[model samples]
Target chain A: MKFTVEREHLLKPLQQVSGPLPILGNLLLQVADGTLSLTGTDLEMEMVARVALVQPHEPGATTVPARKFFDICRGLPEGAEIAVQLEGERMLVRSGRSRFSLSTLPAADFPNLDDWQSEVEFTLPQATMKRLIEATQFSMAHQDVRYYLNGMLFETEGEELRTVATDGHRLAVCSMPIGQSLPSHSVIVPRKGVIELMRMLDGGDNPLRVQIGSNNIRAHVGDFIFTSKLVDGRFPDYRRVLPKNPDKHLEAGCDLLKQAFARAAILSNEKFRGVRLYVSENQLKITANNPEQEEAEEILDVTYSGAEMEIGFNVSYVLDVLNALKCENVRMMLTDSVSSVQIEDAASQSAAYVVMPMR
Target chain B: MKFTVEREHLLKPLQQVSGPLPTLPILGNLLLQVADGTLSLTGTDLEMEMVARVALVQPHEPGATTVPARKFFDICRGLPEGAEIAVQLEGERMLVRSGRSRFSLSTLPAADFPNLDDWQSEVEFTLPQATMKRLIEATQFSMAHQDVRYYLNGMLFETEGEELRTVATDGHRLAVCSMPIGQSLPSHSVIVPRKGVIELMRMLDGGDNPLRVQIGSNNIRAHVGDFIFTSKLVDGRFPDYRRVLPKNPDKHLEAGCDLLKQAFARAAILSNEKFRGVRLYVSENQLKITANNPEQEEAEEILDVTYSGAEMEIGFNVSYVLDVLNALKCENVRMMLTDSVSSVQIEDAASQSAAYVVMPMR
Candidate 1:
């Protein structure tokens, strides 16, 4: 391709599209209609970004090593105007006093996704999409044997869009109103795809168009289109794992409780990561003990009127829930010492978390 | 031991002393002693020791105990600033209490903690902390890492005729820095281990305060404000750095340090990942640097320079060149060259406080 573009406009798009891939670690550059499109794929997902050419000469296509080209573009001085053209099997990139002739592969050999029709398409605010991902992404299982739990579940019913992730020990659920009624749909986005899509989001209020196919999901973000293949498996019923009515309630400041747990965790068992909590009238005592005989104790004042009871839990789960809540106050409901505890933001109904209690 | 110390006073010393060591677990503990209204915190790994002292509040009972350094540091850091920590030794455990938080850490006897006792210094000198820091920074990067020649893994500190010199070499390259102490002293030299030099450098704040340095037959110590650092000397003879100095060369090239650095940095992108060799072609007023990798990728750049020597081509490791260039902050750098077989000498054109020599790669 023969084109020229400003370094400022091209660097970000190039970085977003050029990722470290396994087999084909190259980016396809295509020039047509005064626009240059860069596409990178690893068979499962593809990121294609397009930038307007400052000066277009000829229409052409080729593929070059993605990382090397990105490094060259990054190393160039800022505000530089870059020019690129194809010469034989090399792609000549020249800007100011610097020139790089990178080896290229045939354009025909570049792998592009098979064209398919979308079965469902919708639009949501970028802020809403970002919250749906961040609030539940931390709970997703990594490399689980069940295969389905290794991804996050996205479900739509009526005007509500819900995101749920569970690793059998805990579950995080977040929902938001998408401002439109849609047909019921459920899909499991693989862990890697979910992370990559999250990285592309900017958490703005701009509208993002999403297209869902039988085996793929696509997001049109700014000048880039991201598509990832969906995992073909059934997600466990997250609603069934969520705790039922838990009669016992304890309310405390989220930040205070987070700090208390963090300190107590320093002395917790390295392998089990277990911390014990003693709840009584208006008082919560957190204690941790390791095999080295080291012990940490923290007593925090909270609003708890339940009969004095003790519970054991993995401190990491509680800390994660508290961090994700991101509220001034948090309310945790427990049925007894053995049942799972349901935690939620005391002021908002958008998110809720459930953690299974350890012995 | 019972003492109440402010969180602000204990946190920094605890952090500076507690580090991950590979020896016995007892070496990982901080030896805390409360004596004469001060709490002394010390940590050692059998090779190096660092001690920090903090004043204790009233009602301080004089005693001593060793507690897990990392755990204590973490607990103290976790406590809010201005918080007064009430520490007491009870039944082989150290109790740390602050506000509503309490921690009982396992402890070992203070007697078991090793200390460099009965040490005598043969040479002593005082210099501004910043000057000492600058002297070490100029040569620390060239020290050999875990080489068969163990003495090369340290920096040689030599004093002679009102000048303190520091030198380091890893066989392929050498760096030497000299600073005047304003006072004549008997000739002396000692090899400070690499880790000790780094640790001592980190403690310096680049201030004008005087730092007292003591060198003995087997150890070197530095007193920086309220902290004391000591390291066992590497018991081996260091290479004679005077022999590495280059003689008068026929070719001298002068160029902007920043310009050459940027050009070499760019050319380095295409150089071989292992050797990183870049060929330099110098003739009169122009300098061209070219490098190619095994993948056939090439990068070339031309820089303007002031030279009147005969045309010559030489190859050197681009990283070594970048290291010396990056260290010199002068506007212009002077390079003295003889032939492709001899080492090249590099230094700032304005000042000769530091000198660098890089052996040819090919």
Candidate 2:
């Protein structure tokens, strides 16, 4: 095979394919007819990037290690035409000022993932898809003992689709009312798949064609297509984890709450870590003390007419919920002692977080 | 003690002083005082930074401390107006925050450092003190083994009232020269105090009233009435490491040489221990790299070559030198290699590196 292509034209697809190729030892580059296709797969996740390289005659193809190919191309002189040729199991890459010969393996040795061609189940705007991912991606448990929590649970019913993620200490749920929905279904997307999906959504503004199968989910946006195998285990019923009718509700500026948390955490004990949040009528105070007898206190005016109460919570849990909302003002709903706290943005109210209180 | 300073103003100096503080348990914040007419010492290094928080006090008399004052200032809120305090040695600190009570700490007995005030010295500037520090600060021998390479050295010297010269190296003697001559007896400034001189010079500039000092042969330079410091001598003769004459000259385009080096170095096997440089030679039209291995062969082509002389050299030492000169490609040099190969630039030959060659492959 022999072809010449512009540097910029090749770098874009090279970078996109290189992202997933690092986790795996080798990537397969297949060119047939007039289309050039790049595939990066690491068992659980795979990305296929297609770009037009040249018009082919006999439908030629080859496979070279992704990292070596990328390094050679990156080092080639910019704006220069790069010529590539396949001679048996060796690929010769040359540009204006440099030439590199990289060894390759047989194209047939590369793994071709089984295509589970399933019918489309639902479609959502790319912006909406990205929003849902961002809101809950941070809450996904990493290597959790309860295997199911290690992935994000996607629940779809009628016109409502919600993405909920939890790491036991805190849970983040974001939902949107779509114009059209499908049958009620739920699937757990593994942590790696969720992360890759978020990255794929970046710089994409067009609508995403999302399709669900028995054991895999696929999202197609622009020139790129993403596929991930769904987790087999059942996800926990998140509805039971959310707080119900709360006894105390306080609405405070998000900036004030963030600052108070930062101050109190400074003096909190290294272990058995807890920060006391004292809630009163229209007032809130945060205090923490360390074993060194050092204390840090911060006060802020909040809008709450409920009875005054003081509760101790793990400082990190409260901070996590506040950081995830990314809102100017957040409202905290406190049900009672030993009950979880529900937090939501004051304006949108669509994205919510629930933190299980610590004794 | 009572005074209010902006958080921004206080944080700058506090951070600089706290850099060398001890991380041990017993040596935690000994004592901090903001008294009249005295500077506070949060001396952590116990050697150099013994007088860190030396403020020009107004009302109170000279006070001393063996306290952890550095942490105290770090915890103070920046947005707040002023921190007022009624300080006393009543067992611990009477800390307060926004009209609320805070924590305190105990103190360690102040340890006295023996003062060294003996040798006499003269001060001169080869270049502006500030510029001298800037040039040497980035490439000083920061990781020298004190006991082993005792003479490999840790200090830089600036001699003035003649051809300005700033010299330093860790046994690899490097001397950078500039012309800043004054009309007078050649004022000689030799082997000045090392670390303290570098730090003090950072604050000076090339002005009419130059930072004057009385340098001693084996003592400290009383740096223009601010801080006094003395350095111990690393006694030994520095080697004349200048490269000999070039035997064979092979001139090639700089851009091509740099690109080949960068590419080949990527695949080059890193030395199992210390960093090793790469070798280069121009045979016919190709640049050969017999580096890192006896069996492995890597070669690249360079299009533009004027000289046909045959000369083989060992690996390039201090790869960054080539990178720096290439990055600042002001003037091209006529690099010549004889039986001995030495790299040189035509312009400012003295200020430029002349002796850099590749050792033969083992």
Candidate 3:
């Protein structure tokens, strides 16, 4: 196949290539009629995309090493167009006066991902899906022994969609009023897939289409298709763990609370990062002491009318919850110190967080 | 001892204290004192120093003590703007308090930190701090690093009357920078150790401020507006740089410095990684830089020049030329050469303070 296209048109798709397959980092490209199909994968997460060619000839297919191909294109003068044509047994890449002959792989041996076909399909704004992934992905388990837990859980019930992730010590939840009343849809997208999907999703009002098959999930954004195989194991039931409601709650300036936590955490014990919070009449006294006997205490005025309560928590856990929250007033609902506490952006129904207290 | 001073006041001296301690990485404390209506801080890595007095108030016991350099600097930097921290020493540790925050730092025995002692008999010259800084920086990178050649690792500071000069070389390449000072001083030269030159570089405020330069028998020291730096000299002889300059070259090529620098940088990418040799093809009015590596990779850059010499080809280690180009702040750099296999004299007409000589490769 022979065609010419702008450099930018292919850069984004090249970025989605799986980095694991360096020996075969070659990408499979197929040109049919007027569209070029670019696919790169490592048997797990496959990023397949198509873009209209500026110029095209007889339909054909070839495979070229991903790194060398991208470098050759990037090295060309910026904003310039590159042309690719199949020679006898090699792929010739040309841009302006610069030319490169890349060794090609047997296109017939290129692994093909199953055509993304499914009975379940829906659409949501690209921004909404992006927020859903970002708002809670940080809490996802990283290389956890419990293989299934090292992924993000997506649960949808009617018009409400909830994205939840937990690493046993802490859990994060972000609610989205996506306005879809479909059957309960639950799937655990692996951690790597979740991160890659978030990086690809741009915050715009443009529509994002998703299709969930029995074993795979496909997301179509713009002209590209991002596909990830569903984790084989079932995700933990997040509903049973979520705190239903708490009678005791307090509201405080989110920024002020975040600063106090950050300062107190400096002197927190290196191993556990423990910080003690004493809630009384109208203030929350935060205190932490490290192994070196260095103590840091900060007093922040909080609107807490509930009976004075003292609780200890891993300052890192609390800080994570506070940082993920994009709100001025953070409303934290607590009950003693043994159970989980529910924290939510006071003005937001779309985002809420839950953290289990540390001993 | 207890006193109050603004955070910004102490931050500067703490900086000089942290500058890649000339030899030891453990020079982590300085003696801070408030006496005689002046709050001064002094730090040393056994071979350097500084004395500064910023605004101070509510002075209680006027004295000096050692405090950890890093912790004190970190606390002062993290404090709010215009914060006047009240520092009080309790035994060996120091307590720093500002508003709602307090930090206690671990310190060492005051007796362990030897005082900044200097003998008065020394050659002294005073010049604008900017002028001195420029002279050192222009030749700083060319100095040898960690090689057995100890003298080549330091820069030479030589002055004859009002003319002050600095020179550095690593055997194959040499750079000399000179400037005339208004003061007609006696002739004296000292090799300021490399790390100390870097510390002094950081401390120097490039303004129209006079700097006092003193050269002792064993070490060199410079005192500027608020910071003073010194380095122990390596007792070795510097080659006679005056003897190597080229004269009556057959051709003078003036080329844009930035263009040549960029072209050399690009050609370096494909040059032999170990030697980094790039071939320069010099013609009537154009200079083409070319390099090829074992990976079958080749890069070329063509630069326009005003030259009428016979066509010639020369090889050079690309980095040396690029370094000279980058250090020179001139629109055009002149290259004077007589043959393809000899050293070439490169200079900036815009700033006569510097001249570089690079050996052509085989």
Candidate 4:
């Protein structure tokens, strides 16, 4: 392919769509219909981005190293027009006085996902998608032995899109409206794909289209198309794990609780990271002691009228929920010293979290 | 022992004085000495020592003890700024109370603290702190790391005539920087170990204030603001770096330092990962660079230059050249070249205060 394009026009798409695959991990560059397409795949997932050509000289396709091409384009001066063309078995990227000749493999060697029809398709604002992922992504297990637990369960039904993640010790669930009704669908997106999706979202109010098949999920945001293979396993029932009912309730300022836990955590046991919480009337006492006999104690006024009780928990779990809740106050529900606790934003119901208690 | 001090003063001194130590364990504790309303903290690893002082406190408490360095430092840092820390030593533990938080830490008797005794200085001088800082920053990068020739693993400080010079070499490349000390001094040389040079550089704030530096037979010490840093010297003969500079190079090239650095960086992307060899082609008013990797990928750049000489091609480890270019603060860089085998000499075209030599790849 031979073309001349603005440096900024191609740099963004090349960065988003160019990643991994073989003819090992080279980007497939194609020119046709006055548009240049870049595609990258790693057998399990693929990304495709398109940029309109500034001027087309010859229309053809070839593969070149994705990282090197991106680097050279970035190193070139801003606003510089880049000229690219194909030489015998090589691809040339030139701008200003700098030029690079990259080895190329036959375009036919590029890999593509097998054809499949989507079972469900829907469009939602990028802002909503971003919120859904941010609320639950942190709870997703990384390389869990259960396989299915290593991904976030994405479910869409009627008018709501829901995301649920659990790493056994902690669980998070969030939901957002999808604007229009669609067939009920569920897919388990692996941890890596979830992370990549979160990074790519523009987080604006612009609309984003999503499609779900039996074994794959695809999303189109602006000029970029992201596709990932779904984990082929049954996800745990999130409803079965969520705390159904609790008798005790406590509400405290979010920032206040976070700071107290962070200070106590420094002295907690390095291995267990456990802190003891003593609750009575409207006062809560936090204490932690490491093997070195170092002790840290904190007291904060909380809205608790239940019977006084002392409980031990992994301080990190509580801290994570408090950090994620972007609200003034946090409400936590507990049944007893041995039961799991449910946490939610006291001012809003956008998300819910459950943390299993430690002995 | 009992005293109260502002959080900022105590925290800064603790942070500066706490680092690696052992005494089989007491070294993990920082010596806190309070006398006449002043608190001074000290930490040492037997070979090196650092002392930091806070001159103001609540009441006069004449006593000394040691507390866990890391724990004390962390608590002081975590406490809210401007909070006064009330400390009291009772029985065997140190009680630190700040606001509503309290910490009881284990301690050792201050008598057990290791001190560098009878540190008599052989030479003492004062110079602008920035000059000492620049001398180390310009040449420290070329020091060898864990080399078999232990002498090459440290930077050499020499006093010649009225100038103080720093030199470091890893055998393949060498860097030399000198600054006028404003006084004639007898010839003396000392090799500061790698860690000492780095840590002392970190302690300096690069200010114009005069800093007092003392050199001893076995140690070197500097007073950086309120902090006193002392490091043990490495004993060995340094290589004669004067012989490394090219005697006579006919070909010369001068180019904008930033422009040349950018060109080299772009060309480096395609250079051989192992060898990192890039070829330089020089001719009249033009320079070309080509880097090829084992993967068959090639990157080339042609830069405009002020040069007039017969064309010459030389190979170099791109990283060595990039380092020198990054350290120089001049807009234009001057390069002197001979044949492909001879090492090239480079310096700032304007000041030429620092000179660097990079050996060819082959």
Best-fitting candidate, scored by lDDT: 1
Ranking by lDDT: 1, 4, 3, 2
The candidates, ranked best first by TM-score, are 1, 4, 3, 2
Local accuracy of candidate 2 as per-residue lDDT tens digits, A1-359: 66667776777677766665532666677766666677777878788777676633334667776876776666656677777778776676666545555566776777666789664467778889888888888888999988888889888877878899998888899988778967888888898888888888765568788887878888888777889889898787778888867878999988768766766666677676678888987888878777666666777888996778888788777777788777899988997767888889988877888888776
Flag regions of model 4 displaced more than 4 Å: A18-24, B19-27, B206-208
lDDT of 3 by residue, B1-362 (tens): 78887877777767766674324323667777768777777777665665555656555667677775655676676666788878888875677777666666555656666675666637787888788778888999988897698888888888788798899998889999989887886777777777777777887878777888888778777778766666677778888888777766667788988768766765676678898899988998988878776655556567779899888888999999999999997899998887887888899956667999999887
Off by over 4 Å in 2: A21-23, A55-59, A271-273, B21-23, B26-43, B46-91, B94-130, B137-279, B283-314, B317-362
What DockQ was computed for model 2? 0.22
- Ranked by TM-score, the better of candidates 1 and 2 is 1
lDDT (Cα, 0-100) at A53 in candidate 1: 76
lDDT of 4 at B256: 98
Provide the interface RMSD of candidate 4 in angstroms, 1 decimal place.
Answer: 1.4
Instruction: List DockQ, one per candidate, in order.
Output: 0.65, 0.22, 0.22, 0.65
Q: Which number leads on TM-score?
A: 1
**RMSD of every prediction:** 1.8, 5.3, 4.3, 2.2
lDDT of 4 by residue, B1-362 (tens): 88888888887678778843444778899998888667888988876788887886477567889988877887777776788988888656888887667777777899888887766888888889889989998999999999999999999999878999999999999999999999877788999988778777877776656788888888899897788989888878898999999999878899999999989999999999889999999999999999999988899999999999789999999999999999887799999999889999999999767999999997
Rate residue B4 of model 2 by lDDT.
39
- Judge the docking of candidate 4 as incorrect, acceptable, medium or high: medium
For residues A212-243, write the lDDT of model 3, one tens digit per residue.
87778888988778888878787777667767
- Tell me the lDDT of model 1 at B264: 87
TM-score of the candidate numbered 4?
A: 0.95
lDDT measured at residue A75 in model 1 versus the true structure, 0 to 100: 77
